[PDB]
């Protein structure tokens, strides 16, 4: 018998198949590989800090959820165990792009779990009532946003507490910020996409035509339940969280579509989260941990219940009934799978955490008019370069 520990930050909310109930099915069938999964008791950004303290203390879990944007960071801090041959055994159970994001320098450190493509959530019934359509161009988007804002309804958000992924994702839909050239990281967060995103959100904020409530504040939930928020860009895994936040408002009326051609992106979209599960330094059971993890990550209907757009290609889960009930009977998982397939490549630098922390601060100022949306991307540039220099890494800008 071997005992495995798995630390995760899956929501485990009402209506979901709880992680402990998924693990229970494994534990009944595999007496020699016994798993205990624990939900991290803290906000998402504190989890890799806990993994670092745990690995230093010599008491880390075997397995831990690591965002794709976090892999380079935990790799650089020496937190990962090479499981290349174990991962190769399970490669055909997963999509190639997310599997590649669990790799550094031809070595694999775990299995991918989900992807986080950005899409557009909107009240389709309300759009039809108000005489509007999903805007096809940035200029149409701004004109339509001003028209709804005149009657106290909003078709866009600017979420200062989600600046890291909302600004990097909408900008990143049209090209990378970070590249590797020989020995160095090459940093440019002021791309054509960054300029386009700043221009669009600057016009929306100048015209009081996007809601600036932080995503994780009660004001965001109140905006949905009160009927004020009738459209927003959103990460695909927000679907169940958004439904719960709505408190029944819009049930049977909403739909999902692709991110529009608003930021010079055409039919492409960006990445907002999405994670794998890494094998940590000091794990005494990588082979058994990876056997369990391949099984876990291919429990497609249970993982979709948690809001995951799964990396697994072993089976296809139907849109959960809870989601299609909310979203007008729409097959929203088909829209999420299309969005995933249109997600532009976007390599993350080690220390992207620190870049997000600084971007959040500037975005609060852009939201209240004390800074420009473009300053968020300048903050990203300077904090990107300073973070790389502080990690002792070679950086060019």
Ligand X SMILES: CC(=O)N[C@H]1[C@H](O[C@H]2[C@@H](O)[C@@H](CO)O[C@@H](O[C@H]3[C@H](O)[C@@H](O)[C@H](O)O[C@@H]3CO)[C@@H]2O)O[C@H](CO)[C@@H](O)[C@@H]1O[C@@H]1O[C@H](CO)[C@H](O)[C@H](O)[C@H]1O
Paired sense of beta strands 184-187 and 395-396, if any: parallel
Q: Least distance in Å: CB of 109 to ligand X?
A: 16
* Cα distance between residue 20 and residue 306, in whole Å: 13
Q: Least distance in Å: CB of 137 to ligand X?
A: 29
Question: Closest by alpha carbon to 130, among 114, 146, 115, 147?
Answer: 147
Q: Least distance in Å: CB of 138 to ligand X?
A: 26
Q: In which residue are the tokens 């009532």 written? A: 129
* Cα distance between residue 291 and residue 178, in whole Å: 33
Residues at the contact surface with ligand X, assessed by CB under 6 A: 10-11, 43-45, 67, 114, 116, 161, 164-165, 216, 237, 273-275, 307, 353, 356-357, 360
Query: Residue 70 annotated as binding?
Result: no
Give the number of other Cβ atoms within 10 Å of residue 13's Cβ. 13
- With respect to ligand X, which residue has the nearer C-beta, 98 or 260? 98
- With respect to ligand X, which residue has the nearer C-beta, 44 or 125? 44
**Cβ pair 236, 28 in contact under 8 A:** no
Rounded to the nearest 10 degrees, the angle between the axes of helix 352-367 and helix 373-390 is: 160
- With respect to ligand X, which residue has the nearer C-beta, 165 or 343? 165
- With respect to ligand X, which residue has the nearer C-beta, 13 or 59? 13
312 Cβ contact list (under 8 Å, min separation 6): 93, 94, 95, 297, 298, 300, 303
The tokens describing 268, both together, are 């492409």
Q: Least distance in Å: CB of 207 to ligand X?
A: 26
- With respect to ligand X, which residue has the nearer C-beta, 207 or 313? 313
**Cβ pair 210, 156 in contact under 8 A:** yes
Q: Least distance in Å: CB of 151 to ligand X?
A: 30
* Cα distance between residue 293 and residue 277, in whole Å: 8
- With respect to ligand X, which residue has the nearer C-beta, 280 or 311? 311
- With respect to ligand X, which residue has the nearer C-beta, 97 or 287? 97
Strand partners, 275: 67
Strand partners, 67: 275
Q: Least distance in Å: CB of 244 to ligand X?
A: 11
Question: Closest by alpha carbon to 352, among 144, 113, 101?
Answer: 101
Q: Least distance in Å: CB of 133 to ligand X?
A: 30
Q: Least distance in Å: CB of 128 to ligand X?
A: 31
**Cβ pair 243, 16 in contact under 8 A:** no
- With respect to ligand X, which residue has the nearer C-beta, 14 or 28? 14
Q: Residue with CB nearest ligand X?
A: 273
Rg of the chain in Å (alpha carbons): 21
Q: Least distance in Å: CB of 125 to ligand X?
A: 27
* Cα distance between residue 377 and residue 318, in whole Å: 38
* Cα distance between residue 205 and residue 373, in whole Å: 9
**Cβ pair 215, 385 in contact under 8 A:** no
Question: Closest by alpha carbon to 169, among 266, 274, 68, 270?
Answer: 270
278 Cβ contact list (under 8 Å, min separation 6): 63, 64, 66, 71, 74, 79, 80, 102, 109, 110
- With respect to ligand X, which residue has the nearer C-beta, 231 or 274? 274
Residues annotated within a binding site: 397
Residues annotated within a binding site for Zn(2+): 397
């Amino acid at each position: 018998v071997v005992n495995i520990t798995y630390m995760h930050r899956l929501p485990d909310s009402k209506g979901m198949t709880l992680v402990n109930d998924i693990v229970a099915k494994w534990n009944k069938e595999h007496p020699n590989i016994q798993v205990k999964a624990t939900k991290f008791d803290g906000k998402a950004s504190e989890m890799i800090k806990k993994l670092e303290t745990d690995v230093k203390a010599g008491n880390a879990p075997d397995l831990a959820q690591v965002g794709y944007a976090e892999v380079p960071e935990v790799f650089t801090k020496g937190l990962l165990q090479d499981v290349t041959d174990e991962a190769a055994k399970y490669k055909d159970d997963f999509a190639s792009a997310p599997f590649a994001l669990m790799q550094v320098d031809g070595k694999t450190y775990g299995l991918p779990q989900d992807t986080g493509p950005l899409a557009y959530f909107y009240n389709a019934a309300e759009f039809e009532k108000l005489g509007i359509t999903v805007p096809k161009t940035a200029d149409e988007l701004i004109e339509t946003a001003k028209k709804t804002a005149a009657q106290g309804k909003y078709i866009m958000t600017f979420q200062p507490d989600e600046a890291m992924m909302m600004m990097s994702g909408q900008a990143g839909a049209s090209g990378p910020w970070y590249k590797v050239d020989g020995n160095s990281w090459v940093v440019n967060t002021q791309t054509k996409g960054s300029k386009a995103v700043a221009d669009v959100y600057q016009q929306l904020i100048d015209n009081k035509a996007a809601l600036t409530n932080p995503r994780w504040d009660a004001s965001f939930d109140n905006s949905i339940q009160s009927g004020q928020l009738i459209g927003t860009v959103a990460a695909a895994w927000e679907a169940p969280l958004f439904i719960d936040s709505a408190g029944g408002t819009g049930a049977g009326e909403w739909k999902v579509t692709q991110l529009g051609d608003w930021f010079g992106n055409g039919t492409k979209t960006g990445s907002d989260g999405g994670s794998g599960v890494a094998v940590l330094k000091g794990s005494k059971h990588p082979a058994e941990a990876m056997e369990f993890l391949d099984w876990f990550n291919t429990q497609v209907d249970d993982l979709v219940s948690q809001g995951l757009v799964v990396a697994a290609t072993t089976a296809d889960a139907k849109t959960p009934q809870k989601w299609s009930d909310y979203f007008s009977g729409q097959d929203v998982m088909a829209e999420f799978k299309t969005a995933n397939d249109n997600m532009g490549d976007f390599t993350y630098m080690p220390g992207f955490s620190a870049v997000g922390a600084a971007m959040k601060q500037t975005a609060a100022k852009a939201a209240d008019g004390s800074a420009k949306v473009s300053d968020v991307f300048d903050t990203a540039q300077k904090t990107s370069v300073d973070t790389l220099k502080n990690l002792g890494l070679s950086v060019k800008e």
